[PDB]
Amino acid sequence: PVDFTGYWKMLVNENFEEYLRALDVNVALRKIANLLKPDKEIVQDGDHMIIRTLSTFRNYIMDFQVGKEFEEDLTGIDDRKCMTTVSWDGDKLQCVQKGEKEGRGWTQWIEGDELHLEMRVEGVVCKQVFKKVQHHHHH
Numbered sequence: 001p002v003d004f005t006g007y008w009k010m011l012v013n014e015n016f017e018e019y020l021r022a023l024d025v026n027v028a029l030r031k032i033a034n035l036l037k038p039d040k041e042i043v044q045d046g047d048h049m050i051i052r053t054l055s056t057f058r059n060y061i062m063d064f065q066v067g068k069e070f071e072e073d074l075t076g077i078d079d080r081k082c083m084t085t086v087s088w089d090g091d092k093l094q095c096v097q098k099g100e101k102e103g104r105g106w107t108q109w110i111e112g113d114e115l116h117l118e119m120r121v122e123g124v125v126c127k128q129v130f131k132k133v134q135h136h137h138h139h
């Protein structure tokens with residue numbers, strides 16, 4: 001039984017600028033965005049999952065029910081919205097973001113004290129890893 005609940009600090013973020021370039025994000029914002037090291041605050045409450053991606057530059061909040069398609073507003077990231085479904089795939093969480101772009105989604109799992117997050121679009125792959133932390137900040 002995987003439970004993603006916790007607070008997590010970014011350790012690595014690989015190939016994020018190419019991921020954003022594939023989303024047609026402009027180069028100035030790609031640089032700004034790749035300097036950011038957001039935290040993740042996750043509360044898993046039955047099939048109700050809240051994933052808060054937190055930084056001083058911006059927060060992006062996901063709040064959904066596993067297995068239920070919903071409209072995800074990503075216009076602050078790439079000026080697009082998607083019809084998104086998050087599903088359990090073994091011990092992994094699989095997200096498919098249907099919309100203008102082909103093959104858009106991500107995959108999340110836990111290894112030890114690491115939260116692993118692979119995000120993808122148009123065959124471009126960005127891999128992030130976060131470490132579980134215990135010192136909390138208000139937000």
Ligand SMILES: C=C(C)[C@@H]1CCC(C)=C[C@H]1c1c(C)cc(O)cc1O
Pocket residue numbers: 013020025029030032033034036038053054055057058059060076077078
């Ligand atoms: C909402 C935030 C913090 C920013 C907002 C601007 C862009 C273009 C991406 C977002 C982002 C996300 C979603 C995740 C991430 O690891 C790094 C980022 O920069």
